[PDB]
Amino acid sequence: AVGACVLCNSQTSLRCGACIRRPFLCCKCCYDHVISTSHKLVLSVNPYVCNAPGCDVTDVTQLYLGGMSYYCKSHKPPISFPLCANGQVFGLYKVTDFNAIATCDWTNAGDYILANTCTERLKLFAAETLKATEETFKLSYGIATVREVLSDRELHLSWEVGKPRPPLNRNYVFTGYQIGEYTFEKDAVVYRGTTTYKLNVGDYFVLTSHTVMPLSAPTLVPQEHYVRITGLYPTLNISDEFSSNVANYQKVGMQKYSTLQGPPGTGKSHFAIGLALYYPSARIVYTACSHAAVDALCEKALKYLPIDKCSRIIPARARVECFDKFKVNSTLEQYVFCTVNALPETTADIVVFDEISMATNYDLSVVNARLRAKHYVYIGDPAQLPAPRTLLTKGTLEPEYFNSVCRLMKTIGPDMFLGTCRRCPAEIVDTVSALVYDNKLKAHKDKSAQCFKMFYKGVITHDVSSAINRPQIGVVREFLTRNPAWRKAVFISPYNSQNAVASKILGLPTQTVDSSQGSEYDYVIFTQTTETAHSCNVNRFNVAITRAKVGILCIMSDRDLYDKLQFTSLEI
Ligand SMILES: c1n[nH]c(-c2nccs2)n1
Ligand SMILES: [Zn+2]
Ligand SMILES: [Zn+2]
Ligand SMILES: [Zn+2]
């Protein structure tokens, strides 16, 4: 009922009744908002509505204070003050960007650009508003009632009329009813339920929308710079394997927070785990948005850090299988590995947050709200894939706008930059170096002479918005007969439908460019499928070709990215 202004902190009884988040606005800022937007409902102890019986006047501009009550022009008593006067909405204790965040639908890229260029308190309001909007949008899709069951990985569904059909990919997790979360893949659909329950005909699914909690802590704490390493105690006996990062581990102790831009295979998990061997007394909470990224940190920690002092935090509502080698849910262990949504309310000497391009400003704030740390380290790469923004359909979101950390890495540069790629053949390293790294990524390996590119547009068929290019999978099939060493390759494409087809025709294991992020394969076969803005995204293209250690075959649709690939060209 009584709080502080989300724009200038001035205390107030006023909240905008028309904002989806009902932000507390002060007398001055509340006016500047109601007078510039369709938002005219103002909430105090009592709402600002005409007290006259059955009068439906709720617009604060058309209301007045008569005695200690509120009335419109038609019912105001002789002695009355217009609620809107002198640039103020009457309340207690007596902005252009705030209006755009309050009224936007989050479908344009300029909406996300603003949610990142604004003040710190408006970044939290934007994050709070966007997530609530994203969640209410989930209520606006049709229910799937089972019509029949084929096998243990197949069934047929009956969709709700009038309400749309949502996309079928692991990117949209349904919730069955209460028989666990379920996923689907294209008349015979594949049912992938978290719980092994014999699919009941008639049982229905619903996209589980969660309550959006208010954000309190900033996306980034205020930066502090120190004269010496603070609260952390370094070893002088620091393993030669981690000698390359000694200087950067010292920068970590001489700042409140630090940003590390680590391109593919430059030593991000090495840096993260080596930080624990450099400050061995220090308690480190390892966080990431995805379970796969918290597990990738676990696999590196298993190798270099004592298994007893490690704990893998697993949320009680167990969704997908994760890391099984640490003691589970021991919040007090020196090394805690946990996803941002499952983070407990604790403190740490250092907090490492990896895969920073996948974080949102909502995630950044949750991290600063649940973990109080001496030091914060943000590891990732703004040249890699960001979190998918389900409501965004108009315009492409640039890296400086993924989150506050990525904004810093693209504007002032990262504090630390891992510049030598030790995974990829020089053909791949030189290509991504020129494409997204300003020629600052260096190749540790030589050219493998196993990196091929083929310009083949083929034929694009659509299965709803997901694309398939059978002539591109046919060209791969031809290639494999003549290059049987490529039998061990992972098939990568920007579309799951293209992958579903290539899995049946080639038999190769399948990965979307997005699900391949953080992983490495000896050989990669990539079919671009289409020459759309999705498949031609340079961040997605960067992740696509940097998965390969030994060889890559790129069947290209785009003349632009094909001409940018520094690979051996193939004919057919
Ligand atoms: C030492 N300096 N960099 C590194 C690594 N880069 C890739 C994985 S480990 N070790
Ligand atoms: Zn204010
Ligand atoms: Zn409003
Ligand atoms: Zn009235």
Residue 398 CA to residue 382 CA, distance in Å, equals: 9
450 in Cβ contact with 550 (< 8 Å): yes
Largest CA distance in the chain: 94
Name beta bridge partners: 375: 350
| DSSP summary character for residue 442 | E
Burial zone of 78 (CB within 10 Å; 0-12 exposed, 13-18 middle, 19+ buried): exposed
Helix (H) or strand (E) holding 363: helix 361-370
Name the residue among 33, 161, 169 with its Cα closest to residue 89. Answer: 33
Token digits of residue 507: 């038999």
**Tokens 């990117």, located at residue:** 171
CA distances to 193, 250, 493 from 451, rounded to whole Å, are: 38, 39, 16
**Tokens 């619903």, located at residue:** 206
Residue 245 CA to residue 242 CA, distance in Å, equals: 6
Token digits of residue 328: 């589970």
Token digits of residue 87: 């640039």
Name beta bridge partners: 183: 192
**Tokens 């102790």, located at residue:** 253
223 in Cβ contact with 255 (< 8 Å): yes
**Start-to-end Cα distance in the chain:** 71
Query: Residue 34, SS3?
Result: helix
**Residue 8 annotated as binding site:** yes
144 in Cβ contact with 167 (< 8 Å): no
* Cβ contacts of 218 within 8 Å, gap of 6 or more: 120, 123, 124, 364, 365, 368
* Cβ contacts of 534 within 8 Å, gap of 6 or more: 494, 540
**Tokens 């229905």, located at residue:** 204
Residue 290 CA to residue 355 CA, distance in Å, equals: 9
Query: Residue 265, SS3?
Result: coil
Residue 397 CA to residue 335 CA, distance in Å, equals: 35
Name beta bridge partners: 356: none
502 in Cβ contact with 493 (< 8 Å): yes
Q: Which amino acid is at 391?
A: L
CA 61 to chain CA mean position, Å: 40
Query: Residue 307, SS3?
Result: helix
> Residues 44, 46, 52, 58: what is their CA dihedral angle, to the nearest 10 degrees?
40
Token digits of residue 215: 């954000």
Of all protein residues, whose CA lies closest to atom 4 belonging to ligand 1? 267
Helix (H) or strand (E) holding 404: helix 404-411
- The CB-based long-range contact list for 82-90 (8 Å cut-off, 24+ gap) reads 83/42, 83/48, 84/31, 84/34, 84/35, 84/60, 87/28, 87/31, 87/32, 88/27, 88/28, 88/30, 88/31, 89/14, 89/25, 89/27, 89/30, 89/31, 89/34, 89/42, 89/48, 89/60, 90/27, 90/65
Name the residue among 567, 497, 561, 508 with its Cα closest to residue 535. Answer: 561
CA distances to 43, 72, 79, 90, 93 from 84, rounded to whole Å, are: 14, 12, 16, 7, 16
113 in Cβ contact with 90 (< 8 Å): no
**Tokens 């389900």, located at residue:** 390
Residue 74 CA to residue 48 CA, distance in Å, equals: 15
* Cβ contacts of 78 within 8 Å, gap of 6 or more: none
**Residue 269 annotated as binding site:** yes
Q: How many Å lie between the centroid of ligand 1 and the Cα of residue 390?
A: 35
Q: Please report the atom of ligand 1 found closest to the CA of residue 422.
A: 7
Q: How many Å lie between the centroid of ligand 4 and the Cα of residue 81?
A: 14
Token digits of residue 251: 């920068």
Q: Which amino acid is at 357?
A: S
> Residues 29, 33, 35, 39: what is their CA dihedral angle, to the nearest 10 degrees?
-140
What are residue 47's phi and psi, to 5 degrees? -70, 155
User: Cβ–Cβ contacts within 10 Å for residue 559, how many?
Assistant: 11
Query: Residue 286, SS3?
Result: strand
CA 495 to chain CA mean position, Å: 19
CA distances to 178, 207, 275, 348 from 334, rounded to whole Å, are: 36, 37, 13, 9
Q: Are strands 204-207 and 174-176 parallel, antiparallel or unpaired?
A: antiparallel
Q: Are strands 11-12 and 3-4 parallel, antiparallel or unpaired?
A: antiparallel
289 in Cβ contact with 384 (< 8 Å): no
Helices of type H across 118-245: 120-138
20 in Cβ contact with 41 (< 8 Å): no
Q: Which amino acid is at 7?
A: L
- Which resolution in angstroms does this entry have? 2.4
CA 169 to chain CA mean position, Å: 17
Domain at 421-564: CATH architecture: 3-Layer(aba) Sandwich (3.40)
> Residues 313, 317, 322, 323: what is their CA dihedral angle, to the nearest 10 degrees?
30
374 in Cβ contact with 283 (< 8 Å): no
Residue 410 CA to residue 402 CA, distance in Å, equals: 10
Residue 572 CA to residue 570 CA, distance in Å, equals: 7
What are residue 105's phi and psi, to 5 degrees? -95, -5
Q: How many Å lie between the centroid of ligand 2 and the Cα of residue 253?
A: 37
Q: Please report the atom of ligand 1 found closest to the CA of residue 418.
A: 3
424 in Cβ contact with 521 (< 8 Å): no
**Residue 406 annotated as binding site:** no
| DSSP summary character for residue 534 | T
Residues with CB under 6 A from ligand 1: 244, 265-267, 270, 422
Q: How many Å lie between the centroid of ligand 2 and the Cα of residue 30?
A: 7
94 in Cβ contact with 27 (< 8 Å): yes
